[PDB]
mmCIF file of C-alpha atoms and ligand atoms in Angstrom:
data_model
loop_
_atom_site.group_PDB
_atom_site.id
_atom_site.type_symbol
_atom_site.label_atom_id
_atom_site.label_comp_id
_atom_site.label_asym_id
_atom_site.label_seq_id
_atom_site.Cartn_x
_atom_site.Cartn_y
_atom_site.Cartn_z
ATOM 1 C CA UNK A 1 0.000 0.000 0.000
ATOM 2 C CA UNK A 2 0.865 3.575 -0.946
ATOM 3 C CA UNK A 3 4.045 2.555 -3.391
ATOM 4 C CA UNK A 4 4.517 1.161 -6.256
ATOM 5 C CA UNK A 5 7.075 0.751 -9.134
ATOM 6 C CA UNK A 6 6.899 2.226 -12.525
ATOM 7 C CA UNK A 7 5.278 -0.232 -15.448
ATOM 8 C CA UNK A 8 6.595 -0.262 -18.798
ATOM 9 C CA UNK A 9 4.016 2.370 -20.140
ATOM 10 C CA UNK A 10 5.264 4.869 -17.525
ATOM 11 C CA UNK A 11 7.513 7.820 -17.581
ATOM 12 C CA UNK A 12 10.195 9.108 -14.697
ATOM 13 C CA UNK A 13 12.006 12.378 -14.750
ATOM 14 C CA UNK A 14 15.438 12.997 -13.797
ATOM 15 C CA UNK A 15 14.237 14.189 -10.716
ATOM 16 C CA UNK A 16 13.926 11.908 -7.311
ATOM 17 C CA UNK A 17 11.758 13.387 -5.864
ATOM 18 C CA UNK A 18 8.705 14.029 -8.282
ATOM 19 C CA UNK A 19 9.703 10.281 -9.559
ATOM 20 C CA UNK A 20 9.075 9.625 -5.695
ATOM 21 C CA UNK A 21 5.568 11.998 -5.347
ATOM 22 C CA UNK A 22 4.506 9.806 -8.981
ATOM 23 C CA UNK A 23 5.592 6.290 -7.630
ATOM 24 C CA UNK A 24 3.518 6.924 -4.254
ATOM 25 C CA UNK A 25 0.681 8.780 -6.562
ATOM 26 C CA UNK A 26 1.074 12.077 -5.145
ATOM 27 C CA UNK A 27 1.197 12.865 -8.777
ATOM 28 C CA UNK A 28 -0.210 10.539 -11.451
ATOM 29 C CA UNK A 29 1.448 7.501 -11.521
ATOM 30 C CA UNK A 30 2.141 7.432 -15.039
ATOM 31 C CA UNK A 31 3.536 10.795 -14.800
ATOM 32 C CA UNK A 32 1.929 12.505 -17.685
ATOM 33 C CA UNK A 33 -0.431 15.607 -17.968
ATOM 34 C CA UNK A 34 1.181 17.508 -14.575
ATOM 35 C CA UNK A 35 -0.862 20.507 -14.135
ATOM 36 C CA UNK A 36 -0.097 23.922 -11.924
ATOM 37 C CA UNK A 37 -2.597 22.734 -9.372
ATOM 38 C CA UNK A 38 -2.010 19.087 -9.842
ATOM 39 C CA UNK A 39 1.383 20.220 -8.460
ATOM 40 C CA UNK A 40 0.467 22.626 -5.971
ATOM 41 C CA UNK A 41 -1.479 19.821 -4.627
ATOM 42 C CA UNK A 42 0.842 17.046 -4.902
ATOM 43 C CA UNK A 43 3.766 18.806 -3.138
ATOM 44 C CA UNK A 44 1.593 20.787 -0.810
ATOM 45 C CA UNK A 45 0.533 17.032 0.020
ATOM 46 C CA UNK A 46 3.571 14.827 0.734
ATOM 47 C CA UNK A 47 6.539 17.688 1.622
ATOM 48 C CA UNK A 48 4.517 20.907 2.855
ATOM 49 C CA UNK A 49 5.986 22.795 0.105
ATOM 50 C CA UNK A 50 4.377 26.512 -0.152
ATOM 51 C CA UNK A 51 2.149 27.156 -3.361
ATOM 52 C CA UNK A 52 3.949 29.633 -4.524
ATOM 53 C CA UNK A 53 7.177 27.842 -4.782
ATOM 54 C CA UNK A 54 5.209 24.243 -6.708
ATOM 55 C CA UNK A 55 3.718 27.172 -9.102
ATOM 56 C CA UNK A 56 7.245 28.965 -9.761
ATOM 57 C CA UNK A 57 9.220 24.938 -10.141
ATOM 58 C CA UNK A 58 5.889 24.078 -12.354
ATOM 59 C CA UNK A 59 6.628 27.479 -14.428
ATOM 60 C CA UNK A 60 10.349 25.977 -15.283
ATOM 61 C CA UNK A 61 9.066 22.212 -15.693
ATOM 62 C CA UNK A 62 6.259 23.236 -18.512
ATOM 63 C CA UNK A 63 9.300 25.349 -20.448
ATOM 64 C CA UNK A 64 10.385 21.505 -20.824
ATOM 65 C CA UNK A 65 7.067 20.183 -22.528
ATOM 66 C CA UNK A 66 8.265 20.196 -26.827
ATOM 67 C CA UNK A 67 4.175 22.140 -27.592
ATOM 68 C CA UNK A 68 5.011 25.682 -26.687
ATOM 69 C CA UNK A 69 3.310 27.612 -24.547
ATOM 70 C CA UNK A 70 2.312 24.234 -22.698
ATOM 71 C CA UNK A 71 -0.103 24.352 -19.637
ATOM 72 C CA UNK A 72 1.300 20.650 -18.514
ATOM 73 C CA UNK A 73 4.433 18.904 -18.180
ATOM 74 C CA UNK A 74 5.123 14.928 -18.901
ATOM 75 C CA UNK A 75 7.747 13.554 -16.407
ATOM 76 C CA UNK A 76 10.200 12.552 -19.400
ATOM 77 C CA UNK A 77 9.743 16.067 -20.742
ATOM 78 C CA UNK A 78 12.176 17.273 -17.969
ATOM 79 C CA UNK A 79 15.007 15.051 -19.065
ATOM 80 C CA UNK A 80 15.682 16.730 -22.334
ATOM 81 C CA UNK A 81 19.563 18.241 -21.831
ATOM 82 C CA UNK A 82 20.386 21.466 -21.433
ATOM 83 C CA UNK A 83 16.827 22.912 -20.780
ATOM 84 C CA UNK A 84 16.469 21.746 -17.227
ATOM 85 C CA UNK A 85 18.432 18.698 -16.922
ATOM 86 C CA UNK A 86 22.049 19.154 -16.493
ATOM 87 C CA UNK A 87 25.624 18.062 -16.154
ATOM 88 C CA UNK A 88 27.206 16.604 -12.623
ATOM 89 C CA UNK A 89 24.322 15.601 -11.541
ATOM 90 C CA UNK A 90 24.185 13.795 -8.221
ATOM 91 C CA UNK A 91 23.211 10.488 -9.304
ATOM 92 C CA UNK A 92 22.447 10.470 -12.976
ATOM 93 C CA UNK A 93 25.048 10.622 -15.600
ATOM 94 C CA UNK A 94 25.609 13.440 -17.711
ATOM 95 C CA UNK A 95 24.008 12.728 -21.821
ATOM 96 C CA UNK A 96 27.186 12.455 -23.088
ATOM 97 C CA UNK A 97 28.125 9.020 -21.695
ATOM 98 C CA UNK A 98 24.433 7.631 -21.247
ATOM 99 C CA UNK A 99 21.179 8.052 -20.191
ATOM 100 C CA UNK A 100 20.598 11.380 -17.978
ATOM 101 C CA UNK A 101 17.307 10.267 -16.070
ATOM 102 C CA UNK A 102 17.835 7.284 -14.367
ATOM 103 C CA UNK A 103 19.934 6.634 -11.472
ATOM 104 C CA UNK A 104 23.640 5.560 -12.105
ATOM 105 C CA UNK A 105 25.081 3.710 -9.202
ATOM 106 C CA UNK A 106 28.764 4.830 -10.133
ATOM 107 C CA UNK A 107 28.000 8.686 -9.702
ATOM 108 C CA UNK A 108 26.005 8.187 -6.692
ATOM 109 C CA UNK A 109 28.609 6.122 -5.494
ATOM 110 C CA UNK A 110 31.035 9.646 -6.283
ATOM 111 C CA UNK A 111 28.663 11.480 -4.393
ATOM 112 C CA UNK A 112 27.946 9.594 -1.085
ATOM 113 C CA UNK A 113 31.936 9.532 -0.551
ATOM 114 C CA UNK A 114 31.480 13.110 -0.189
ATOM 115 C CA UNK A 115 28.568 12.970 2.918
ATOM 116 C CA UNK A 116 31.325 12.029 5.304
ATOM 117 C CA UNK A 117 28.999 11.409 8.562
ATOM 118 C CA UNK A 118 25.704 9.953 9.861
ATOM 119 C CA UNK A 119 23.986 13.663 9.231
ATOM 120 C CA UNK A 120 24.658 15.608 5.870
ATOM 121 C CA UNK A 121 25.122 18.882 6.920
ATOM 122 C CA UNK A 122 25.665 22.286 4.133
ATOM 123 C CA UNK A 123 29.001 21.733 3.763
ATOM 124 C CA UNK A 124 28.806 17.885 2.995
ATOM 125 C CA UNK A 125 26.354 19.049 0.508
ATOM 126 C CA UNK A 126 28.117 21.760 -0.913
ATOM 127 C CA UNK A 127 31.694 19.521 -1.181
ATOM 128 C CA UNK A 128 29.642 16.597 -3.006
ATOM 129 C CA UNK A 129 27.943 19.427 -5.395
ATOM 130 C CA UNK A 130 31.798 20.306 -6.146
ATOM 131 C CA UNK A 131 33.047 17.475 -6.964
ATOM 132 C CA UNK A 132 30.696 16.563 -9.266
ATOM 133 C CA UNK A 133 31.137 19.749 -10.999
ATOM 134 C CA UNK A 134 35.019 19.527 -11.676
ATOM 135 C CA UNK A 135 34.607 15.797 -12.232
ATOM 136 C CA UNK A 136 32.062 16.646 -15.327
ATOM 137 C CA UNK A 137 33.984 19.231 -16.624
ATOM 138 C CA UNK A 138 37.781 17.097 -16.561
ATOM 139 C CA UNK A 139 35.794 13.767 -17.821
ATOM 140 C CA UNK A 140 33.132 15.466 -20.430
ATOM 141 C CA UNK A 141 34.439 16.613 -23.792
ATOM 142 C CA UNK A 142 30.841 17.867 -23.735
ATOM 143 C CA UNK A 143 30.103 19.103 -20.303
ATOM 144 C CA UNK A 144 28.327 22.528 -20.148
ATOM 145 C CA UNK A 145 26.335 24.107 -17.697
ATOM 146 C CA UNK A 146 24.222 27.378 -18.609
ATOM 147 C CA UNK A 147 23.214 29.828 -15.783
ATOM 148 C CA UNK A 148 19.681 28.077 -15.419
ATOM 149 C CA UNK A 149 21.473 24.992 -14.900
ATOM 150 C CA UNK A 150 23.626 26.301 -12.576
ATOM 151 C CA UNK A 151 21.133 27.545 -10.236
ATOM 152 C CA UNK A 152 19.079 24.587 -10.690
ATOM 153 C CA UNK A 153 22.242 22.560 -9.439
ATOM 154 C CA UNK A 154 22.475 25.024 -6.369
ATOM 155 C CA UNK A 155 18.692 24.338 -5.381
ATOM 156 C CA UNK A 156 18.612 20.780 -5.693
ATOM 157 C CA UNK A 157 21.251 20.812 -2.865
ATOM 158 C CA UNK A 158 19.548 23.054 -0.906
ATOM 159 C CA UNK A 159 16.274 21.277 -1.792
ATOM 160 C CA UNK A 160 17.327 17.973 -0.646
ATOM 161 C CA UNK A 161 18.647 19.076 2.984
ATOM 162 C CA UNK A 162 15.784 21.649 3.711
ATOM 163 C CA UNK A 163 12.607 19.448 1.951
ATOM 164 C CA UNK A 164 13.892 16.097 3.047
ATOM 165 C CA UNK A 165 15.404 17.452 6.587
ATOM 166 C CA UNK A 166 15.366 20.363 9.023
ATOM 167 C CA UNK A 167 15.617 23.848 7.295
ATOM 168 C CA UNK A 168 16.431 25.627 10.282
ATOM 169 C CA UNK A 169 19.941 23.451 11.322
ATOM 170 C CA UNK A 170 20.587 22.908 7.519
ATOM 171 C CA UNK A 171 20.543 19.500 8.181
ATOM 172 C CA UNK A 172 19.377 16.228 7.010
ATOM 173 C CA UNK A 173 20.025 12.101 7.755
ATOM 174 C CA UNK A 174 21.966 10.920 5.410
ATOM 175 C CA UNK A 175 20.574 7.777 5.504
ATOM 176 C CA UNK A 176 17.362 9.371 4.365
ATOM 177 C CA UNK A 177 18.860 11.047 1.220
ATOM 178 C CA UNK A 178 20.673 8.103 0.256
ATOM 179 C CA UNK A 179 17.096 5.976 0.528
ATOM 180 C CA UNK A 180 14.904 8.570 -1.574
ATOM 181 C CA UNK A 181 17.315 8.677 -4.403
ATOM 182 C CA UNK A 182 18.057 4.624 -4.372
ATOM 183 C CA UNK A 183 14.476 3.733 -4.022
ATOM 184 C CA UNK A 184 12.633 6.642 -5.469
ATOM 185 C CA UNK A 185 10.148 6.392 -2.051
ATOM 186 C CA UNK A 186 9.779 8.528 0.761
ATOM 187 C CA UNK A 187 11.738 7.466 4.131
ATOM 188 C CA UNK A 188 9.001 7.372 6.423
ATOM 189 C CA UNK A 189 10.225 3.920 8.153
ATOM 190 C CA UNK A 190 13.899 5.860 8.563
ATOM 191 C CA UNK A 191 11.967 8.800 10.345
ATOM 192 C CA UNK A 192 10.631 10.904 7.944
ATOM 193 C CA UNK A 193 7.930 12.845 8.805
ATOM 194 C CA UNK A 194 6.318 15.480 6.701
ATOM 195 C CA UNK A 195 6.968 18.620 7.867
ATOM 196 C CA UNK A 196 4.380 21.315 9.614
ATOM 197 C CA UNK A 197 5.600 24.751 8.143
ATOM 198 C CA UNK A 198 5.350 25.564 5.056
ATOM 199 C CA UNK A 199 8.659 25.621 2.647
ATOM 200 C CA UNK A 200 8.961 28.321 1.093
ATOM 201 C CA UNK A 201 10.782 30.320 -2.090
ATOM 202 C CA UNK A 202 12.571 32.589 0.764
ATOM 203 C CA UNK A 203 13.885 28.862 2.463
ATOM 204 C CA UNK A 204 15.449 27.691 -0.769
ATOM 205 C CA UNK A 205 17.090 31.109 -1.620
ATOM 206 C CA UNK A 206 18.576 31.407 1.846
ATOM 207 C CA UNK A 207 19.674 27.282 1.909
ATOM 208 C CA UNK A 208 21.072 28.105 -1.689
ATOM 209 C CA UNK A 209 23.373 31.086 -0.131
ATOM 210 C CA UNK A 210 24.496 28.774 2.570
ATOM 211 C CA UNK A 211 25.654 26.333 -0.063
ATOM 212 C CA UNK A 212 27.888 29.015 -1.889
ATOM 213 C CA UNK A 213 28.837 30.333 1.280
ATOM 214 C CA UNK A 214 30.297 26.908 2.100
ATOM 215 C CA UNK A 215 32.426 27.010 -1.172
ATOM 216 C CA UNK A 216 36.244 27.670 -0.620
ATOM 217 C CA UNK A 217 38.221 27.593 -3.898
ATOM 218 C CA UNK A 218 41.009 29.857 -4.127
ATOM 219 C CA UNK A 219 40.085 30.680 -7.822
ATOM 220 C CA UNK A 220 36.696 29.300 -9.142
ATOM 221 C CA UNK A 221 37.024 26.946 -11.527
ATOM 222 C CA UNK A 222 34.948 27.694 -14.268
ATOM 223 C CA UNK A 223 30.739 27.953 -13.253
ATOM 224 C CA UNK A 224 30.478 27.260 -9.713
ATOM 225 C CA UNK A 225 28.528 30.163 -8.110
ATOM 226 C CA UNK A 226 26.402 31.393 -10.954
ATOM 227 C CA UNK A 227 22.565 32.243 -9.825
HETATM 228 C C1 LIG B 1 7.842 20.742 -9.924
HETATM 229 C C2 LIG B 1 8.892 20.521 -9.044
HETATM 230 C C3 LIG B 1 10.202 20.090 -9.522
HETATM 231 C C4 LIG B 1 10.792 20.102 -10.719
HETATM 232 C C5 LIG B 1 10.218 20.698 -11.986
HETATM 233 C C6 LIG B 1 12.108 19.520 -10.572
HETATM 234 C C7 LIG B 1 12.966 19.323 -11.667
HETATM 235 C C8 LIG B 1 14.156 18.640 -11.561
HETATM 236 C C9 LIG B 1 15.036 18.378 -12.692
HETATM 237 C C10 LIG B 1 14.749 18.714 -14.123
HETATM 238 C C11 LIG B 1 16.141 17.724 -12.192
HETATM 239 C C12 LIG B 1 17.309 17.200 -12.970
HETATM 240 C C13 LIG B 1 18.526 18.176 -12.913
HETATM 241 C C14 LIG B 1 19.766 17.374 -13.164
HETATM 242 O O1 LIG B 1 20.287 16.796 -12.152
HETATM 243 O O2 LIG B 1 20.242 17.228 -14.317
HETATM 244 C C15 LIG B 1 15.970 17.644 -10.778
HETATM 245 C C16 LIG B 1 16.896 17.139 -9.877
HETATM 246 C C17 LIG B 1 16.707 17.123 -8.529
HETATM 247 N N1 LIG B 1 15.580 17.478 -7.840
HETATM 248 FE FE1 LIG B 1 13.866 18.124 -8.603
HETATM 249 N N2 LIG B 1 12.254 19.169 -9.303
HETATM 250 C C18 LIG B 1 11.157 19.457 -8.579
HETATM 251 C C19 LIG B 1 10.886 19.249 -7.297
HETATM 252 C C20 LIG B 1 11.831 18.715 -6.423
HETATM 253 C C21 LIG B 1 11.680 18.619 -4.999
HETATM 254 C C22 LIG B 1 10.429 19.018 -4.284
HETATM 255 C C23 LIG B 1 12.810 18.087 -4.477
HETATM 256 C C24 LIG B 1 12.995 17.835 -3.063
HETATM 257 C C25 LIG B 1 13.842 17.059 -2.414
HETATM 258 C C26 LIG B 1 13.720 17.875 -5.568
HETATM 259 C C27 LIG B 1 15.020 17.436 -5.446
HETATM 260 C C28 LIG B 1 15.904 17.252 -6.532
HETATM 261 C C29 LIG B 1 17.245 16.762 -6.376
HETATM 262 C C30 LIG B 1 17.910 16.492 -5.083
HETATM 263 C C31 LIG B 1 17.800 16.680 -7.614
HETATM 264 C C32 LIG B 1 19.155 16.314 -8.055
HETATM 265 C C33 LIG B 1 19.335 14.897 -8.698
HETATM 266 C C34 LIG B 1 20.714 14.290 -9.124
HETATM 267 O O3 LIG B 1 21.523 15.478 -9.086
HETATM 268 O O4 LIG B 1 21.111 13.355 -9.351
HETATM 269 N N3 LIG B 1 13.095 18.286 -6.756
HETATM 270 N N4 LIG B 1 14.755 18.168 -10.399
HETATM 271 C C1 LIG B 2 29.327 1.388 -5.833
HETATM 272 O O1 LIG B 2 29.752 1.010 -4.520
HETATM 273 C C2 LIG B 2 29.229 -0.256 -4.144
HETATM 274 C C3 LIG B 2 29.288 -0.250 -2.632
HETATM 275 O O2 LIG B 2 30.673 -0.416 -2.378
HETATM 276 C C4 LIG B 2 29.983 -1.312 -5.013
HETATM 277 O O3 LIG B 2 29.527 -2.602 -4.644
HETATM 278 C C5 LIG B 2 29.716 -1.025 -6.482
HETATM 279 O O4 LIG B 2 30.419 -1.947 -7.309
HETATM 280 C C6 LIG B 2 30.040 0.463 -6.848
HETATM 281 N N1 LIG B 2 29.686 0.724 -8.208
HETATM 282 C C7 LIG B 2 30.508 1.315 -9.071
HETATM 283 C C8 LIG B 2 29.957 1.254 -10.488
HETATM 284 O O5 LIG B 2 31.594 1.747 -8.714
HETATM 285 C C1 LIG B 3 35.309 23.902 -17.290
HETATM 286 O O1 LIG B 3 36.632 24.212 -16.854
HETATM 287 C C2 LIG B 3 37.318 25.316 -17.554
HETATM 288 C C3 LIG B 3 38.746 25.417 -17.006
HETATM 289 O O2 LIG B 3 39.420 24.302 -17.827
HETATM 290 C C4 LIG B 3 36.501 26.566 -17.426
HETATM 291 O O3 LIG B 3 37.071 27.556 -18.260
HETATM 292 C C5 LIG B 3 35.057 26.311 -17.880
HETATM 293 O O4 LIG B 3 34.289 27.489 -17.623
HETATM 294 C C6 LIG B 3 34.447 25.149 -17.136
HETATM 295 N N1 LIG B 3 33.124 24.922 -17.685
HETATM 296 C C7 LIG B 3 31.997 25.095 -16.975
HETATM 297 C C8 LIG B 3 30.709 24.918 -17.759
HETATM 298 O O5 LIG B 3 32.015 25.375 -15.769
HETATM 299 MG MG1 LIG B 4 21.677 15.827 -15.117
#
């Protein structure tokens, strides 16, 4: 009950979490014909999140759908590189190599080395982020990453520690993070709990400073920082 896998007419995004909110039918299971309030609704639902902030994320997401002008969004829509989807990702490859919307146990594997204790705090966050970044760019003939992307890398960060964890520390389980993304389920058994306040544009901004503010090159190397 409440979870279940995707079938072969189904499409996933390169997102965990709304592959998450569709495999627990928060959204439609299939993951076609998202809507502004079908989104509202959904992550108002399972994570709390503020309308405001589903309507701006749904704004970006329909920019993905190939009919212009589109009032809805298809999960696979979203994995199309270079409009959302990006380079040094987390835990999908980037195009060049592969696939960019499922998970890729070798990059995750990258990552996690990175979240160095039981609790992921900014930093741990930030350094992973990093990592993935110069990684991309030193292994990618290919790699690019345009200022949308950039601040789209940024937020999913922040997104991950203040949606999945405690805004207010900047902190989140690490086992919790590493269960979402290899599951694609919420980690209610681990302790997850949907939060009661409201998360909000204004939280993701200020998470997203913290994570730049936790960046220490001595010379940036190439698009690191760009909101
Ligand atoms: C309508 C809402 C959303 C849209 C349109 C959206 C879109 C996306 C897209 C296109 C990607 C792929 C970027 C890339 O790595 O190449 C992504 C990644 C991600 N999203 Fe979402 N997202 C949404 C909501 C959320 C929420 C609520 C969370 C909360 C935890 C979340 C967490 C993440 C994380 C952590 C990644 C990075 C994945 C990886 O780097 O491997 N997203 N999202
Ligand atoms: C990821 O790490 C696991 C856990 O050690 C290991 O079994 C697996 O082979 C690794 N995968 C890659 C592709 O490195
Ligand atoms: C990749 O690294 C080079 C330094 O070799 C830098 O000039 C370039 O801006 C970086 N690319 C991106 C997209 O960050
Ligand atoms: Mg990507």
């Amino acid at each position: 009950s409440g979870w279940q896998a995707p079938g072969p007419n189904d499409v996933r995004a390169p997102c965990p979490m709304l592959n998450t909110l569709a495999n627990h039918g928060f959204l439609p299971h299939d993951g076609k014909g998202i809507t502004v309030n079908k989104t509202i609704d959904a992550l108002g639902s399972a994570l709390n999140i503020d309308a405001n902030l589903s309507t701006l994320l749904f704004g970006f997401a329909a920019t993905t759908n190939p009919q212009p002008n589109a009032t809805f969004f298809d999960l696979d829509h979203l994995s199309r590189h270079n409009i959302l989807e990006h380079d040094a990702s987390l835990s999908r490859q980037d195009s060049y190599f592969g696939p960019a919307d499922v998970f890729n146990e070798a990059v995750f594997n990258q990552t996690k080395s990175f979240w160095t204790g039981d609790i992921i705090d900014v930093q741990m966050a930030a350094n992973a982020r990093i990592v993935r970044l110069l990684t991309s760019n030193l292994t990618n003939p290919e790699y690019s990453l345009s200022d949308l992307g950039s601040a789209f890398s940024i937020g999913e960060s922040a997104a991950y520690i203040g949606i999945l964890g405690d805004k207010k520390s900047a902190t989140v389980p690490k086992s919790w993070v590493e269960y979402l993304f290899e599951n694609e389920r919420l980690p209610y058994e681990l302790g997850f709990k949907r939060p009661n306040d409201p998360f909000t544009t204004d939280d993701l901004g200020d998470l997203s400073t913290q994570i730049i503010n936790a960046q220490h090159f001595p010379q940036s190397p190439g698009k690191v920082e760009k909101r």
